[PDB]
């Protein structure tokens, strides 16, 4: 059946932006869980969910299976394996938290769609290190906007 372990649940400052809007700084709830996988031969899936305490219409989520992580690892050149990924992801988020209330945060969290804010499309969750020369992306995740089923299901657990 569907069981989950909660690894991380915090509200973070997030720079939300689309290909047409301006960078809005919002307080977003970032939830990270491990769930039993579809297949007994796989490790637990990582579940990332973003919500807004002031907007029940706002929902983004992503399920990262062991296999999904392999593609991620290759595409971004990650040097760890799936087993340590959740903690490293969390460690990065904690650095964003440590820096969020500073004049010029060295680390910040972005939610950026390459499309219009008017579009029901994927948004990239980016953990970015700020630099005078050029910003460095430590991790990029492709989050999907919640479907009608996902939102109903989520709200039904609230």
XYZ file of N, CA and C in Angstrom:
474
model
N 0.818 -1.219 0.000
C 0.000 0.000 0.000
C 0.850 1.266 0.000
N 0.196 2.421 0.084
C 0.897 3.699 0.039
C 1.195 4.259 1.426
N 2.437 4.095 1.872
C 2.885 4.676 3.129
C 4.015 5.653 2.855
N 4.194 6.621 3.746
C 5.225 7.630 3.552
C 5.971 7.951 4.840
N 7.232 8.343 4.687
C 8.040 8.861 5.782
C 8.352 10.323 5.494
N 8.004 11.206 6.424
C 8.279 12.632 6.258
C 9.722 12.940 6.633
N 10.475 13.499 5.690
C 11.878 13.819 5.923
C 12.086 15.297 6.222
N 11.260 16.140 5.615
C 11.477 17.583 5.649
C 10.155 18.299 5.434
N 9.886 19.298 6.266
C 8.652 20.066 6.165
C 8.840 21.466 6.731
N 9.202 22.409 5.868
C 9.479 23.772 6.306
C 8.992 24.798 5.295
N 8.675 25.992 5.784
C 8.332 27.114 4.920
C 9.596 27.904 4.610
N 9.892 28.076 3.327
C 11.090 28.797 2.915
C 10.734 29.983 2.039
N 11.606 30.986 2.035
C 11.499 32.084 1.086
C 11.873 31.557 -0.291
N 10.983 31.748 -1.258
C 11.224 31.281 -2.616
C 11.024 32.400 -3.629
N 11.991 32.565 -4.526
C 11.860 33.526 -5.613
C 11.074 32.903 -6.763
N 9.782 33.209 -6.826
C 8.901 32.644 -7.841
C 8.851 33.546 -9.068
N 9.016 32.961 -10.250
C 9.035 33.751 -11.477
C 8.654 32.939 -12.710
N 8.122 33.629 -13.714
C 7.802 33.022 -14.999
C 8.502 33.801 -16.105
N 8.297 33.386 -17.351
C 8.963 34.024 -18.483
C 8.379 35.403 -18.797
N 7.378 35.816 -18.026
C 6.683 37.069 -18.304
C 6.510 37.956 -17.073
N 6.522 37.351 -15.889
C 6.315 38.100 -14.653
C 7.629 38.520 -14.003
N 7.524 39.293 -12.927
C 8.690 39.735 -12.173
C 8.899 38.832 -10.959
N 10.139 38.757 -10.489
C 10.493 37.865 -9.391
C 9.750 38.211 -8.101
N 8.733 37.415 -7.786
C 7.985 37.568 -6.542
C 8.575 36.682 -5.450
N 8.782 37.257 -4.271
C 9.368 36.524 -3.156
C 8.277 36.016 -2.218
N 8.020 34.712 -2.262
C 6.919 34.123 -1.506
C 7.392 33.100 -0.481
N 6.646 32.984 0.612
C 6.915 31.962 1.612
C 6.206 30.678 1.207
N 6.987 29.661 0.858
C 6.433 28.412 0.351
C 6.742 27.231 1.268
N 5.771 26.334 1.417
C 5.965 25.120 2.198
C 6.626 24.049 1.342
N 7.817 23.625 1.745
C 8.517 22.562 1.039
C 8.446 21.275 1.845
N 7.804 20.267 1.269
C 7.662 18.974 1.920
C 8.443 17.911 1.155
N 9.179 17.083 1.889
C 9.941 16.000 1.283
C 9.646 14.707 2.022
N 9.207 13.693 1.284
C 8.870 12.410 1.884
C 9.510 11.269 1.116
N 9.617 10.114 1.767
C 9.967 8.879 1.084
C 8.733 7.994 1.081
N 8.424 7.390 -0.060
C 7.260 6.519 -0.132
C 7.648 5.158 -0.672
N 6.918 4.133 -0.249
C 7.107 2.804 -0.802
C 6.941 2.896 -2.311
N 7.844 2.247 -3.057
C 7.868 2.354 -4.519
C 6.826 1.451 -5.174
N 6.551 1.689 -6.452
C 5.618 0.855 -7.200
C 6.128 -0.579 -7.266
N 7.444 -0.722 -7.376
C 8.071 -2.031 -7.488
C 8.864 -2.384 -6.234
N 8.711 -3.625 -5.751
C 9.407 -4.099 -4.550
C 10.913 -4.220 -4.765
N 11.347 -4.163 -6.020
C 12.761 -4.309 -6.351
C 13.465 -2.951 -6.384
N 12.696 -1.884 -6.199
C 13.253 -0.538 -6.200
C 13.380 0.000 -4.782
N 14.245 0.992 -4.607
C 14.326 1.706 -3.343
C 13.121 2.627 -3.255
N 12.927 3.242 -2.095
C 11.812 4.157 -1.899
C 11.915 5.367 -2.821
N 10.770 5.819 -3.326
C 10.706 7.024 -4.147
C 10.816 8.254 -3.257
N 11.427 9.308 -3.781
C 11.458 10.585 -3.088
C 10.290 11.416 -3.594
N 9.536 12.005 -2.675
C 8.405 12.838 -3.055
C 8.626 14.270 -2.594
N 8.649 15.194 -3.548
C 8.791 16.609 -3.243
C 7.482 17.328 -3.548
N 6.998 18.118 -2.597
C 5.734 18.824 -2.768
C 5.851 20.256 -2.278
N 5.436 21.200 -3.117
C 5.446 22.613 -2.761
C 4.027 23.156 -2.693
N 3.701 23.814 -1.585
C 2.378 24.403 -1.400
C 2.490 25.801 -0.802
N 1.376 26.527 -0.801
C 1.336 27.887 -0.272
C 0.240 28.000 0.784
N 0.628 28.353 2.007
C -0.313 28.432 3.121
C -1.420 29.457 2.879
N -1.154 30.423 2.005
C -2.111 31.491 1.728
C -2.831 31.291 0.398
N -2.546 30.179 -0.271
C -3.157 29.904 -1.566
C -3.324 28.407 -1.813
N -4.521 27.903 -1.531
C -4.818 26.482 -1.683
C -4.845 26.056 -3.148
N -4.805 27.032 -4.050
C -4.792 26.750 -5.482
C -3.382 26.400 -5.955
N -2.396 26.687 -5.112
C -0.992 26.493 -5.465
C -0.500 25.106 -5.063
N -0.080 24.319 -6.049
C 0.486 22.999 -5.790
C 1.463 22.567 -6.878
N 2.692 22.262 -6.470
C 3.670 21.649 -7.357
C 4.224 20.399 -6.692
N 4.475 19.364 -7.483
C 5.022 18.133 -6.934
C 5.886 17.377 -7.930
N 6.690 16.462 -7.406
C 7.594 15.669 -8.219
C 7.914 14.387 -7.477
N 7.768 13.260 -8.160
C 8.200 11.994 -7.596
C 9.504 11.590 -8.263
N 10.537 11.388 -7.455
C 11.840 11.004 -7.973
C 12.141 9.571 -7.572
N 12.025 8.663 -8.533
C 12.353 7.268 -8.298
C 13.856 7.089 -8.429
N 14.341 5.931 -8.001
C 15.747 5.600 -8.128
C 16.180 5.794 -9.577
N 15.320 5.375 -10.501
C 15.599 5.495 -11.928
C 15.557 6.945 -12.408
N 14.638 7.733 -11.855
C 14.567 9.153 -12.184
C 15.852 9.850 -11.765
N 16.386 9.449 -10.616
C 17.601 10.060 -10.097
C 18.799 9.785 -10.999
N 18.804 8.627 -11.649
C 19.902 8.283 -12.548
C 19.999 9.268 -13.704
N 18.854 9.621 -14.278
C 18.812 10.593 -15.363
C 19.240 11.958 -14.841
N 18.771 12.286 -13.643
C 19.108 13.536 -12.978
C 20.616 13.614 -12.755
N 21.165 12.535 -12.210
C 22.584 12.430 -11.895
C 23.458 12.640 -13.130
N 23.062 12.033 -14.243
C 23.815 12.143 -15.487
C 23.722 13.548 -16.075
N 22.511 14.095 -16.101
C 22.260 15.396 -16.717
C 22.940 16.557 -15.993
N 23.066 16.453 -14.673
C 23.614 17.554 -13.882
C 24.983 17.250 -13.286
N 25.461 16.029 -13.497
C 26.779 15.640 -13.033
C 26.894 15.539 -11.524
N 25.869 14.988 -10.883
C 25.899 14.795 -9.439
C 26.871 13.676 -9.076
N 27.570 13.838 -7.957
C 28.641 12.919 -7.581
C 28.246 11.966 -6.458
N 26.964 11.955 -6.115
C 26.470 11.052 -5.087
C 25.487 10.073 -5.705
N 25.114 9.047 -4.950
C 24.076 8.137 -5.409
C 22.756 8.424 -4.700
N 21.713 7.716 -5.114
C 20.358 7.978 -4.653
C 20.220 7.956 -3.132
N 20.979 7.087 -2.474
C 20.825 6.881 -1.035
C 21.115 8.127 -0.192
N 22.019 8.978 -0.664
C 22.377 10.173 0.094
C 21.711 11.432 -0.459
N 21.052 11.303 -1.606
C 20.451 12.457 -2.272
C 19.464 13.255 -1.408
N 18.516 12.570 -0.747
C 17.540 13.309 0.064
C 18.203 14.216 1.101
N 19.208 13.704 1.804
C 19.889 14.495 2.825
C 20.680 15.659 2.226
N 21.304 15.429 1.075
C 22.055 16.482 0.397
C 21.123 17.580 -0.102
N 19.973 17.171 -0.631
C 18.932 18.098 -1.064
C 18.504 18.959 0.122
N 18.241 18.305 1.249
C 17.868 18.993 2.479
C 18.980 19.920 2.978
N 20.227 19.459 2.911
C 21.357 20.288 3.323
C 21.410 21.582 2.516
N 21.123 21.480 1.224
C 21.078 22.651 0.355
C 19.940 23.592 0.740
N 18.786 23.020 1.063
C 17.639 23.814 1.484
C 17.944 24.550 2.781
N 18.693 23.902 3.667
C 19.062 24.510 4.940
C 19.997 25.697 4.737
N 20.823 25.629 3.695
C 21.696 26.745 3.355
C 20.877 27.911 2.812
N 19.811 27.597 2.085
C 18.892 28.625 1.608
C 18.202 29.302 2.787
N 17.814 28.503 3.778
C 17.176 29.022 4.983
C 18.121 29.932 5.769
N 19.361 29.487 5.942
C 20.359 30.256 6.683
C 20.640 31.628 6.071
N 20.368 31.771 4.777
C 20.749 32.974 4.041
C 19.567 33.851 3.627
N 18.352 33.339 3.784
C 17.176 34.004 3.224
C 16.903 35.405 3.784
N 17.301 35.657 5.028
C 17.031 36.954 5.648
C 18.245 37.883 5.652
N 19.082 37.767 4.627
C 20.263 38.616 4.509
C 20.149 39.561 3.319
N 20.885 40.667 3.376
C 20.859 41.671 2.319
C 21.101 41.027 0.959
N 22.215 40.311 0.843
C 22.522 39.557 -0.366
C 22.802 38.092 -0.054
N 21.748 37.265 -0.064
C 21.846 35.831 0.232
C 22.815 35.126 -0.710
N 23.763 34.378 -0.155
C 24.691 33.607 -0.976
C 23.971 32.447 -1.651
N 22.972 31.901 -0.967
C 22.166 30.818 -1.515
C 20.696 31.208 -1.520
N 20.016 30.945 -2.629
C 18.588 31.217 -2.709
C 17.836 30.143 -3.490
N 16.544 30.023 -3.203
C 15.702 29.020 -3.838
C 14.800 29.675 -4.877
N 14.804 29.134 -6.089
C 14.014 29.689 -7.182
C 12.971 28.704 -7.669
N 11.805 29.223 -8.034
C 10.820 28.445 -8.766
C 10.541 29.189 -10.062
N 11.130 28.711 -11.153
C 11.113 29.455 -12.405
C 10.592 28.630 -13.573
N 9.504 29.098 -14.173
C 8.992 28.493 -15.393
C 9.564 29.223 -16.602
N 10.002 28.463 -17.600
C 10.492 29.051 -18.842
C 9.308 29.468 -19.705
N 8.107 29.248 -19.180
C 6.877 29.613 -19.869
C 6.160 30.742 -19.136
N 4.997 31.133 -19.649
C 4.215 32.200 -19.038
C 3.552 31.741 -17.741
N 3.376 32.675 -16.810
C 2.690 32.386 -15.556
C 1.238 32.010 -15.827
N 0.755 32.375 -17.010
C -0.614 32.083 -17.412
C -0.760 30.636 -17.879
N 0.361 29.928 -17.969
C 0.352 28.554 -18.460
C 0.418 27.511 -17.346
N -0.324 26.425 -17.541
C -0.288 25.269 -16.656
C 0.890 24.380 -17.052
N 2.092 24.775 -16.642
C 3.308 24.105 -17.098
C 4.310 23.851 -15.971
N 5.272 22.948 -16.214
C 6.337 22.640 -15.252
C 7.161 23.862 -14.859
N 7.606 23.897 -13.605
C 8.498 24.949 -13.125
C 9.761 24.323 -12.536
N 10.910 24.927 -12.817
C 12.173 24.438 -12.274
C 12.448 24.987 -10.880
N 12.596 24.084 -9.919
C 13.031 24.454 -8.583
C 14.554 24.451 -8.581
N 15.151 25.637 -8.498
C 16.600 25.781 -8.565
C 17.198 26.251 -7.249
N 18.219 25.546 -6.782
C 19.003 26.029 -5.659
C 20.243 26.706 -6.229
N 20.311 28.020 -6.060
C 21.312 28.825 -6.743
C 22.242 29.536 -5.773
N 23.540 29.451 -6.048
C 24.532 30.202 -5.294
C 24.828 31.504 -6.024
N 24.691 32.618 -5.315
C 24.888 33.932 -5.914
C 26.370 34.283 -6.013
N 26.741 34.918 -7.118
C 28.127 35.277 -7.376
C 28.194 36.627 -8.078
N 29.301 37.338 -7.894
C 29.501 38.608 -8.576
C 29.746 38.375 -10.065
N 30.239 37.186 -10.397
C 30.610 36.854 -11.768
C 29.492 36.125 -12.506
N 28.875 35.156 -11.836
C 27.765 34.418 -12.427
C 27.164 33.442 -11.426
N 25.838 33.402 -11.376
C 25.138 32.519 -10.450
C 25.370 31.050 -10.788
N 25.572 30.245 -9.752
C 25.876 28.833 -9.917
C 24.727 27.967 -9.409
N 24.149 27.171 -10.302
C 23.047 26.284 -9.940
C 23.569 24.964 -9.390
N 23.307 24.710 -8.112
C 23.744 23.473 -7.471
C 22.796 22.316 -7.768
N 21.512 22.627 -7.897
C 20.519 21.599 -8.171
C 19.290 22.185 -8.844
N 18.786 21.474 -9.846
C 17.587 21.893 -10.555
C 16.609 20.724 -10.647
N 15.391 20.935 -10.160
C 14.354 19.917 -10.243
C 13.186 20.423 -11.080
N 12.647 19.550 -11.923
C 11.524 19.907 -12.779
C 10.209 19.536 -12.097
N 9.607 20.506 -11.416
C 8.359 20.283 -10.688
C 7.144 20.411 -11.601
N 6.157 19.545 -11.385
C 4.925 19.569 -12.161
C 3.806 20.230 -11.366
N 2.941 20.990 -12.056
C 1.787 21.595 -11.386
C 0.767 20.519 -11.054
N 0.191 20.583 -9.860
C -0.760 19.576 -9.430
C -1.983 19.495 -10.323
N -2.378 18.275 -10.670
C -3.607 18.059 -11.421
C -4.803 18.234 -10.493
N -6.007 18.124 -11.046
C -7.220 18.229 -10.245
C -7.257 17.129 -9.189
N -6.805 15.940 -9.571
C -6.760 14.803 -8.659
C -5.763 15.036 -7.528
N -4.576 15.520 -7.884
C -3.521 15.776 -6.908
C -3.954 16.792 -5.856
N -4.553 17.890 -6.302
C -4.998 18.931 -5.385
C -6.112 18.440 -4.461
N -7.089 17.738 -5.028
C -8.179 17.182 -4.234
C -7.624 16.217 -3.197
N -6.727 15.345 -3.643
C -6.100 14.367 -2.765
C -5.331 15.056 -1.644
N -4.544 16.066 -1.998
C -3.781 16.803 -0.999
C -4.686 17.482 0.024
N -5.657 18.253 -0.458
C -6.561 18.966 0.436
C -7.365 18.008 1.317
N -7.614 16.804 0.814
C -8.354 15.798 1.570
C -7.537 15.233 2.733
N -6.245 15.545 2.766
C -5.392 15.117 3.870
C -5.142 16.267 4.840
N -5.751 17.414 4.559
C -5.611 18.592 5.410
C -6.822 18.757 6.319
